């Protein structure tokens, strides 16, 4: 939860890091996004590729972004530690964030909250000792109809309740990946009990057309 | 002239795939509507499509409303040899706040049409799509799409035959609120910690890269090629005058039915949470109080959602705004200071820390917030903490600042006895 | 011809387009108060205290970095203005230690002088504040990183005076902190200079350390011989000894810097 | 015919690590010419 480094034997600037060679072809694709003189907008994207790669950030993964792009390194640490998506410490094999904001806390995610505690024997910001989960609070995911809800890596798992949570859990634990989305018997964010719109067949190509196109 | 409003018809719904129960991809789009005479949209020329916004009354969907068509026509203007961008804002962080999510997985198609002709009638040559970092999934459906309008010649190299060259870039952020902010977006892009600029310059002078960009919120992108298909006067005929369109409404919080739709503009909105969410939880008369736009705007008890209608006019005589038109409802069992005192705690941790009033001061009322929840507080600090609200109000560099400070202003407003009793209670209590 | 006219108080001064309102006000003799703006620095309008009301305005505008318009009218001491410079403020000091009494900055103190010309007499802050460990940047510059207030003249410095891009801003929000991440030694031969461009006690001389009071020393004007620049100086002595050195400005030598072997 | 009963967004269940920016490699060969600012970056 500090935002300054301390070198370890495991995170120093001597900790091996490089990207593979699959990912160094990546790296040209993003870096031609953006106009020639101004490399540095890859920084994001780059940076986030190397959290793919290794799972986390250490110091070193920051200093080779920092020579491929050739940007000063203080200003890769600055993206680092701005945004909240980047490891800086290693997370877990399936790092779950569970939303707290008030739209999420109506719809109960204390209990969402709590019962992956109980069911995972630790407290939040914490990893479990086989080091196959970490779990943490987070803010609001865009997924708000849906609550309440988690981000387990890169999917969502809605309207949870704690029996949904504990059996994502233990599909995770099989080493099985779980379907993301709606837990609850809709498929995305449509009413339950019934679709209140969109109900008939939508119009095909040119319906309502102006005249003069 | 209408009296009332809503009961949108399923044939004047623009997004049609908003449930994903269709085709998302090319062809879906297709069959749809999408991507139709899109040629002869583009070889109408700017000014012929920012006529058609600015006739159709569309204003921005992002939270600020500001009227689009005259937005974008700040574009309209001879190059001096930099580029020109438009920067599609798809970080949708607004707590409540998830319609711009289901428009990219379900309805991508619409957004990348958008892309190309909102770009055309601004001269632009890409489009940036900013994306929260969380969207994976929806980011990686958005590139397939993408991809799609390439191959078919949609866009890039002369799209739609049209003579016009077009990128449509898909960036990534990484986690901050704060990148919602247009200038923090731009920052972001550039490959910095995503801090606002001050203005002037404005975008459209000095952007993205240095050069004139626009940025554009996802629905507000996703519109406009229906507008100029089946024109500005057929989204005017919606809605209020200066309220006009379609918008998509996220009922979230103490409902029956929690859902995204698509609505008329003006619709009232207790019509909106009974007809579409399946009313409140315990009955209407079980209401608290809403959010009626997100958690940046204040909080209206339950009198005044009797009647309120939900457009920006109306939102805003009821000392309140629409926003993102994102409901959170609220019912009687709801501990309101709680409530808010999260979302302050929200805004406490997004904050960029870039500016004095913000970094200091949404930091300072998170924690009066949080003894305000246990009441260890006096009543003279009610009125501290209304004053300390307006110091940041209209004195930091972005909008977040005046985010933070206007939902405590509205549970002050209208629950001061509630701040009041939870007080009088801690002090016997601990007497 | 070029100039446009705009009022100060309702007292009308010819400016250059670009001219900012800050800078506007300046010509008339009103010093706007300040705290992240620096005129040898590039604009950040970041500590907010140099807002100031113009006229038939409902917005405070920030005057270091907002271009004055023709026909504004700066209200440089209208009780909006007022009131907002009393926000500021008070925001500055919530989070400030009280360290006064210990500060090398004391006495000489921009974030004191401006409290007492411009802030109010007294805090209703009551909370605890924050505390942010310290950093390590070398033998020179001792930093008592507490008393920072976020106001990056230090990091523009650095990476547009001195060409060195290793300070920086980590963290977000409140827990912003202003250092090198890494522990890291800022090492230039212009790296001294941030202890007078740092406006409270953050950044103080290791040398100096309590060794003397701004208001007991003795100014003598000089000149440096440390090279043959030429670089014009101030020795403040003390009960007839050397204190410390500080540059002396002359913009067509050293500006308001000095190398640091001359200080 | 016509069905309104399923969701027909499954293919992102099978998306991983690099689908992003797989899909941006493939993208790369449609792109423009990027613009240049003139010079290799501020620093130049
Ligand atoms: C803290 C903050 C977060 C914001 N987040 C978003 C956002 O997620 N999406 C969005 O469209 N606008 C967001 N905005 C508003 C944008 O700054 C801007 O007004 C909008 O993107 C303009 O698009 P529009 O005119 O089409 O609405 C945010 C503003 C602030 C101050
Ligand atoms: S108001 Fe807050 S988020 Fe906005 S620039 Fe200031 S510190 Fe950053
Ligand atoms: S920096 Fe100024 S206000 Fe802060 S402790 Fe030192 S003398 Fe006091
Ligand atoms: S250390 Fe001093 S100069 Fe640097 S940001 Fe803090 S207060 Fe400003
Ligand atoms: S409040 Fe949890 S996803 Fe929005
Ligand atoms: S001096 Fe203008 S904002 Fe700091
Ligand atoms: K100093």
Redesign the pocket.
């Given at each position: 939860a500090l935002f300054v480094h301390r070198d370890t034997p495991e995170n120093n600037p001597e900790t091996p890091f490089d990207f593979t060679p699959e990912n160094y072809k990546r790296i040209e694709a993003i870096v031609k996004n953006y106009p020639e003189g101004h490399k540095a907008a890859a920084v994001l994207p780059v940076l986030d590729l190397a959290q793919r790669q290794n799972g986390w950030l250490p110091i070193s993964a920051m200093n080779k972004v920092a020579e491929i792009l050739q940007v000063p390194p203080m200003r890769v640490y600055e993206v680092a530690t701005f945004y909240t998506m980047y490891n800086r410490k290693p997370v877990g094999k399936y790092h779950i964030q569970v939303c707290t904001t008030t739209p999420c806390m109506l719809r109960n995610s204390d209990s969402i909250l709590e019962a992956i505690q109980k069911k995972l024997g630790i407290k939040v910001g914490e990893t479990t000792p086989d080091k196959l989960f970490t779990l943490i609070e987070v803010e609001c995911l865009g997924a708000c109809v849906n609550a309440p809800m988690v981000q387990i890596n890169d999917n969502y798992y809605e309207d949870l309740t704690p029996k949904d949570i504990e059996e994502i859990i233990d599909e995770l634990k099989a080493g099985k990946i779980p379907k993301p989305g709606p837990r609850s018997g809709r498929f995305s964010c449509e009413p339950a009990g019934g679709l209140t719109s969109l109900t008939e067949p939508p119009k095909g190509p040119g319906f309502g057309v102006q005249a003069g196109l | 002239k209408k009296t009332s409003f809503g009961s949108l018809k399923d044939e004047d719904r623009i997004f049609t795939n908003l449930y994903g129960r269709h085709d998302w991809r090319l062809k879906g789009a297709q069959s749809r509507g999408d991507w139709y005479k899109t040629k002869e949209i583009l070889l109408k020329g700017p000014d012929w499509i920012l006529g058609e916004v600015k006739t159709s009354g569309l204003?921005?969907?992002?939270?600020?409303?500001?009227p689009?068509g005259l937005?974008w026509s700040f574009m309209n203007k001879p190059s001096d040899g930099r580029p020109k961008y438009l920067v599609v804002?798809?970080?949708?962080?607004?707590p409540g706040?998830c319609k711009?999510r289901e428009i990219i997985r379900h309805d991508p198609h619409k957004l990348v049409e958008g892309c190309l002709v909102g770009g055309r009638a601004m001269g632009a040559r890409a489009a940036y799509i900013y994306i929260?970092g969380e969207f994976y999934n929806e980011a990686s459906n958005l590139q397939v799409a993408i991809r799609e309008a390439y191959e078919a010649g949609l866009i890039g190299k002369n799209a739609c035959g049209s003579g016009y060259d077009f990128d449509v870039f898909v960036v990534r952020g990484a986690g901050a609120?704060?990148?919602?902010?247009?200038?923090?977006?731009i920052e972001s892009i550039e490959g910095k910690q995503g801090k606002?600029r001050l203005k002037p310059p404005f975008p459209a002078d000095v952007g993205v890269f240095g050069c004139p960009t626009t940025?554009?919120?996802?629905?507000?992108?996703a519109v406009s090629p229906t507008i100029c298909r089946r024109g500005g006067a057929w989204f005017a005929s919606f809605g209020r005058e200066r309220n006009s369109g379609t918008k998509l409404f996220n009922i979230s919080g103490h409902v029956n039915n929690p859902c995204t739709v698509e609505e008329e503009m003006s619709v009232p909105l207790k019509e909106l949470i009974e007809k579409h969410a399946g009313g409140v939880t315990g009955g209407w008369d079980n209401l608290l109080a809403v959010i009626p736009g997100g958690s940046?705007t204040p909080l209206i008890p339950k009198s005044v959602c009797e009647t309120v209608l939900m457009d920006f006019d109306a939102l805003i005589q009821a000392q309140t705004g629409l926003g993102?038109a994102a409901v959170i409802v609220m019912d009687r069992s709801t501990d309101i200071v709680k409530a808010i005192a999260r979302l302050i705690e929200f805004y406490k941790h997004?904050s960029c820390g870039q500016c004095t009033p913000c970094r200091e001061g949404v930091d300072w009322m998170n924690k009066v917030m949080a003894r305000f929840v246990r009441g260890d507080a006096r009543p003279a600090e009610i009125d501290s903490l209304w004053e300390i609200s307006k110091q940041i109000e209209g004195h930091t560099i972005?909008?977040?600042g005046?985010?933070a400070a206007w939902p405590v202003q509205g549970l002050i407003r209208h629950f001061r006895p509630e701040l009041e009793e939870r007080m009088q209670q801690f002090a016997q209590q601990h007497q | 011809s070029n100039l446009i006219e705009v009022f100060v108080d309702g007292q009308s001064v010819m400016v250059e387009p670009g001219t900012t309102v800050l800078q506007a006000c300046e010509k008339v003799g009103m010093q706007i108060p300040r705290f992240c703006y620096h005129e040898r620095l590039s604009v950040a309008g970041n500590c907010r205290m140099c807002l100031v009301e113009i006229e038939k305005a409902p917005k405070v505008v920030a005057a270091c970095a907002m271009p004055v318009m023709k026909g504004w009218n700066i209200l440089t001491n209208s009780e909006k203005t007022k009131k907002a410079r009393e926000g500021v403020m008070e925001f500055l000091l919530a989070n400030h230690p009280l360290d006064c009494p210990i500060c090398d900055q004391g006495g000489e103190c921009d974030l004191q002088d401006q409290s007492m010309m411009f802030g109010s007499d007294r805090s209703r802050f009551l909370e605890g504040k924050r505390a942010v460990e310290d950093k390590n940047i070398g033998p020179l510059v001792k930093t008592i990183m507490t008393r920072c207030i976020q106001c990056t003249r230090c990091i523009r410095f650095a990476s547009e005076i001195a060409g060195v891009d290793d300070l920086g801003t980590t963290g977000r929000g409140n827990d912003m902190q202003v250092g090198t991440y890494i522990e890291k030694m800022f090492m230039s031969e212009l790296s001294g200079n941030i202890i007078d461009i740092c406006p409270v006690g953050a950044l103080t001389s290791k040398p100096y350390a309590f060794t003397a009071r701004p208001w007991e020393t003795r100014k003598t004007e000089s000149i440096d011989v440390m090279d043959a620049v030429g670089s014009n100086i101030v020795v403040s002595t003390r009960t007839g000894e050397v204190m410390r050195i500080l540059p002396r400005m002359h913009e067509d030598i050293n500006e308001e810097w000095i190398s640091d072997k001359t200080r | 015919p016509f069905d309104n009963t399923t969701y027909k967004n499954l293919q992102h269940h099978d998306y991983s690590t690099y689908t992003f920016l797989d899909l941006n490699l493939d993208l790369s060969k449609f792109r423009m010419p990027q613009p240049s600012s003139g010079r290799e970056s501020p620093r130049h």
């Open positions: - | 204003r921005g969907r992002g939270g600020a409303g500001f689009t937005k804002n798809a970080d949708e962080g607004e706040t711009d929260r609120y704060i990148c919602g902010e247009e200038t923090a977006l606002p940025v554009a919120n996802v629905e507000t992108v940046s993102t997004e972005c909008a977040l005046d985010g | - | -």
